Curated annotation (Swiss-Prot):
It comes from Homo sapiens (Human). The DVD domain (residues 377-400) contains a conserved docking site and is found in the mammalian MAP kinase kinases (MAP2Ks). The DVD sites bind to their specific upstream MAP kinase kinase kinases (MAP3Ks) and are essential for activation. The D domain (residues 37-57) contains a conserved docking site and is required for the binding to MAPK substrates. Dual specificity protein kinase which acts as an essential component of the MAP kinase signal transduction pathway. Essential component of the stress-activated protein kinase/c-Jun N-terminal kinase (SAP/JNK) signaling pathway. With MAP2K4/MKK4, is the one of the only known kinase to directly activate the stress-activated protein kinase/c-Jun N-terminal kinases MAPK8/JNK1, MAPK9/JNK2 and MAPK10/JNK3. MAP2K4/MKK4 and MAP2K7/MKK7 both activate the JNKs by phosphorylation, but they differ in their preference for the phosphorylation site in the Thr-Pro-Tyr motif. This is Dual specificity mitogen-activated protein kinase kinase 7. Ubiquitous; with highest level of expression in skeletal muscle. Isoform 3 is found at low levels in placenta, fetal liver, and skeletal muscle.
Amino acid sequence: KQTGYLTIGGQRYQAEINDLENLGEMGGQVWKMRFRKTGHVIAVKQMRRSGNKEENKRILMDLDVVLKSHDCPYIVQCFGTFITNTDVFIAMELMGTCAEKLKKRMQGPIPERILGKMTVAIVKALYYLKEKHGVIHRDVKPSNILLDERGQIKLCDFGISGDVWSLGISLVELATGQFPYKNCKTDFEVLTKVLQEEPPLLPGHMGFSGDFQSFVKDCLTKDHRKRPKYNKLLEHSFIKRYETLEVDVASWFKDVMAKTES
């Protein structure tokens, strides 16, 4: 298909691995690279033909989904691929940070303003995944939510091929700056807390809108059978509010990344 091409914006370039400058690792081996022939800076996943066959199956499934999702603006886009005898390089849209690294930098709550726009983008991405490819995600975390300096929020291409309840937990973590289950010393203890304890709802003493508290309360319905599908979350007043409301995400993001490090 598209291999040996980078397709950035509208343009298309005859490309090759030598036509890229490696600017260093970002965080699974994903590089920050410069396309020499334009100066375009991009993200590059290297898949080593000699790697864990399980990492590589995971990367190929995840890429399959991204290539299918060219039309969804809430999912990081593929620019193209290079295949050599030893490696596949996967050119991805470069984003500024993930929500986890963004929380660590903030060292406190993220404003409801920001998390509204993020809930819209993520719910829509997950709806697009189920609706149009019958993909469930089964790994919704702050580390899988990506932001860029132009205010775009997108769902990250990791286990993008395998719910509501994790979006809830992700939103409480970022709203408050605290993981609800940060005291649990094992994974089984977390699950024990999920089943046995009241859902970890937003507190009422941080000036969160009733809409935001309702959306999370909904997401953290303890009975599987009474939790709403996406069809119904997209109709929640919280989403509707932040679909239309202009929020300067781009400015807020720049302020945070400038006034903090790693």
